Amino acid sequence: FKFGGSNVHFGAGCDSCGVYPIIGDRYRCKDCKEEIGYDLCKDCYETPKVPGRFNQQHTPDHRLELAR
Amino acid sequence: FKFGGSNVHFGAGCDSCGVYPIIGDRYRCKDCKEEIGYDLCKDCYETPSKVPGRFNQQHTPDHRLELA
Ligand SMILES: [Mg+2]
Ligand SMILES: [Zn+2]
Ligand SMILES: [Zn+2]
Ligand SMILES: [Zn+2]
Ligand SMILES: [Zn+2]
């Protein structure tokens, strides 16, 4: 069981705006390798391109997936 | 960014033992469409068991679980 479903992502924060936890849809990078990962809120996914809050090497060619 | 990576799953609990949050690997159901979802910890996963779920999940042995 997961409380909130995909409406809330505890422990996950947006690497552009810094909201924590991400409320609503979350877009996770799949090619960024750092274990901290790279995530975006739906607003920052829609209006795009920060390099990262924690030294993540996110490139414009990286692909993002919706995290259910 | 997500703290703890795949070593902790905040907001996610095991439907067999009830641990919350799930520490370690987590297995989520692809076919259970209840918003609460269906999840299991790794030891409970690898010891197969009847676990219909704790929140009215209609989880059948035919349902498939993916590592999250
Ligand atoms: Mg607890
Ligand atoms: Zn954002
Ligand atoms: Zn990336
Ligand atoms: Zn368990
Ligand atoms: Zn199921």
Of B3, B8, B39, the CB nearest to A1: B39
3-state secondary structure chain B: CECCHHHEECCECCCCCCCCCEECCEEEECCCCCCCCCEEEHHHHHCCCCCCCCCCCCCCCCCCEEEC
B3 min Cα distance to partner chain A (Å): 6
In the PDB record, what is the listed experimental method? X-ray
Please check whether residue B30 lies inside any domain of the structure: yes
B33 contacts: CB under 8 Å, gap ≥ 6: none
Number of domains in chain A: 1
Give me the phi and psi of A44, to 5 degrees please: -70, -25
* Chain A residues closer than 8 Å to B39 by CB: 1-2
Please check whether residue B20 lies inside any domain of the structure: yes
A39 contacts: CB under 8 Å, gap ≥ 6: A9, A12, A13, A14, A15, A22, A26, A27, A28, A29, A67, B1, B2
Please check whether residue B67 lies inside any domain of the structure: no
Give the range of the structural domain holding residue B25, as residue numbers without chain letter: 1-62
Please check whether residue A47 lies inside any domain of the structure: yes
Nearest C-alpha in B relative to A28: B1
Distance A7 CA to ligand 3 centre (A): 22
Please check whether residue A66 lies inside any domain of the structure: no
Please check whether residue B52 lies inside any domain of the structure: yes
| Cβ atoms of residues A10 and A36 within 8 Å | no
| Cβ atoms of residues A68 and A6 within 8 Å | yes
Please check whether residue B68 lies inside any domain of the structure: no
Please check whether residue B34 lies inside any domain of the structure: yes
